[PDB]
């Protein structure tokens, strides 16, 4: 089963974007559905063999085969259309779906959800939940970035470097420990705010409660 290899995509709250690539076009429309256009070359123009429209919870997948020439927007669907649900999708479409999944995932990891201003830094929790990327942009120039795996740090001088594992955490210049302490305070806070606002949204029935900016630079 596909569910055993990746999780279903989520396109909620993602800004529209039309990204051309060498073998494909990917588009996040205004409706938040996600479209993937397959591009083939003939003669001297490029066409679109099939279109994969994915719902916002990617649960319902509409896929169609028109013949259309590439354009500024995705082709409109014909009648030769196939409608599938996530768990009955045949292997032939999995690789494409995993392509859209990895794309959405990367966009989420750079699309802010909660911005938070402290007396020393501008925090930014991204949308790639759970274990979302977490940037701490200290005002003095120091940068910090936390992923489920690596943790990137930069210093004013530009000594850009990275770290692995919890082996070196304690043994470090206590100034950098100060930066990490403030960043973990911010992370706990931002996750708490996300959780409580989400819960009220669970009750609520209207317009989104995210993105959200908190505080201000003095």
């Amino acid at each position: 089963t596909l569910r055993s290899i990746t999780s279903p995509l989520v396109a909620h709250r993602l800004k529209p974007i039309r990204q051309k690539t060498k073998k494909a076009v990917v588009s996040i429309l205004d409706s938040e559905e996600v479209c993937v256009e397959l591009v083939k070359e003939y003669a001297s123009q490029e066409y679109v063999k099939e279109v994969l429209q994915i719902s916002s919870d990617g649960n319902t997948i509409t896929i169609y085969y028109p013949n259309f020439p590439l354009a500024d927007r995705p082709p409109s669907p014909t009648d030769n259309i196939s409608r599938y649900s996530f768990d009955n999708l045949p292997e032939k479409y999995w690789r494409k779906y995993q392509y859209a999944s990895r794309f959405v995932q990367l966009v989420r990891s750079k699309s802010p959800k909660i911005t938070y201003f402290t007396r020393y830094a501008k925090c930014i929790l991204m949308e790639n939940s759970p274990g979302a990327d977490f940037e701490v942009w200290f005002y003095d120039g120091v940068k910090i970035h936390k992923t489920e795996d690596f943790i990137q740090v930069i210093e004013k001088t530009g000594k850009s470097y990275t770290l692995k594992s919890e082996s070196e955490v304690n043994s470090l210049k206590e100034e950098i420990k100060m930066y990490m302490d403030h960043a973990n305070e911010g992370h706990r806070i931002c996750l708490a705010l996300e959780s409580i606002i989400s819960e009220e949204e669970r009750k609520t029935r209207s317009a989104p409660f995210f993105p959200i900016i908190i505080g201000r630079k003095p």
């Binding site: 990204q19 051309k20 690789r95």
Partner: peptide, 22 residues
């Protein structure tokens, strides 16, 4: 397709726009 790279500069303009309200 599972070879494709898609992280080029138009996406960089998109990301700039994302962080501009900050």
């Amino acid at each position: 397709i599972d070879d494709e790279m898609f992280y080029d500069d138009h996406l960089e303009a998109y990301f700039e726009q994302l962080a501009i309200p900050g």
